[PDB]
Homo-oligomer: A and B are copies of this chain.
Amino acid sequence: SQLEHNIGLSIFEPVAKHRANRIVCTIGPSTQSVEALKNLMKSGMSVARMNFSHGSHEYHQTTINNVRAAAAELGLHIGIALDTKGPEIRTGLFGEVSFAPGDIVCVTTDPAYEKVGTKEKFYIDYPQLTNAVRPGGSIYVDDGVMTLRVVSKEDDRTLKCHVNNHHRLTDRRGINLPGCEVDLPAVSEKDRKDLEFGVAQGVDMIFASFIRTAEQVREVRAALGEKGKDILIISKIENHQGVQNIDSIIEASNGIMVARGDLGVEIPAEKVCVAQMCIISKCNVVGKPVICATQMLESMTSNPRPTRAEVSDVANAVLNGADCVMLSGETAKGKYPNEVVQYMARICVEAQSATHDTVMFNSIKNLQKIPMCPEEAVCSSAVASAFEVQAKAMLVLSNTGRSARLISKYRPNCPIICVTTRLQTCRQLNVTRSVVSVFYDAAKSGEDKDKEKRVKLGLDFAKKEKYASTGDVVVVVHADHSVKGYPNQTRLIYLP
Contacts and interface: CB of A to CB of B under 8 A. Distances in A.
Interface of A: 1-4, 6-12, 144-145, 240, 243-244, 260-261, 264, 267-278, 280-282, 284-285, 294-299, 304-317, 320-321, 343, 346-347, 349-351, 353-354, 359-360, 362-364, 366-368, 370-374, 376-378, 380-382, 384-385, 387-390, 473, 480, 483, 488-494
B308 A381 contact: no
A277 B355 CA distance: 11
A372 to B, nearest CB: 5
Contact of A377 (B12, B282, B385): B385
Contact of A381 (B4, B310, B381): B381
B489 A268 contact: no
A216 to B, nearest CB: 20
20 contacts: A1-B359, A3-B284, A3-B321, A6-B278, A6-B282, A9-B274, A11-B267, A11-B278, A145-B305, A269-B306, A269-B308, A272-B308, A273-B311, A274-B350, A294-B308, A312-B312, A371-B389, A380-B385, A381-B382, A489-B490
B363 A390 contact: no
Nearest to A284: B3
Nearest to A267: B11
Given A381-B388, A388-B380, A315 B273 contact: yes
The A contact surface, by secondary structure, is helix
- How many copies of this kind of chain does the complex include? 4
A285 B11 contact: no
Contacts of A309: 295-298, 307, 309-310, 312-314
A265 to B, nearest CB: 10
A384 B381 contact: yes
Contacts of A7: 278, 281-282, 285, 367
A322 to B, nearest CB: 12
A372 B494 CA distance: 14
Contacts of A276: 312
A272 B311 contact: yes
Max chain B Cβ within 10 angstroms of own Cβ: one of A9, A285, A346, A385: A385
Contacts of A316: 273, 312-313, 316
Contacts of A367: 3-4, 7
Contact of A273 (B305, B347, B483): B347
Contacts of A274: 9-11, 350, 353-354
A4 B281 CA distance: 8
A321 B307 CA distance: 21
B11 A240 contact: yes
A474 to B, nearest CB: 10
Contact of A278 (B9, B480, B493): B9
Contacts of A368: 388
A261 B488 CA distance: 49
Contact of A350 (B6, B273, B359, B493): B273
A305 B269 contact: yes
A8 B320 CA distance: 14
Most buried by B among A144, A360, A388: A388
Contacts of A314: 309
